Amino acid sequence: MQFKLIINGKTLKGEITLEAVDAAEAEKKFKQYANDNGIDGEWTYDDATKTFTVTE
């Protein structure tokens, strides 16, 4: 399924999408992405829209 990440960071903002089987797997991938970009913040997840938000 397509999952989305909304980035509300200090330097980067935007939205990225990737494919995952379920929300737990998408969370892992997005947290790995965040590490690759030096993004550290508070995470929320909206199951209806399959959308995470990370807010720095």
Curated annotation (Swiss-Prot):
It comes from the Bacteria. Sequence repeats lie at residues 2-56. It is found in: Secreted, Cell wall. This is Immunoglobulin G-binding protein G. It comes from Streptococcus sp. group G.
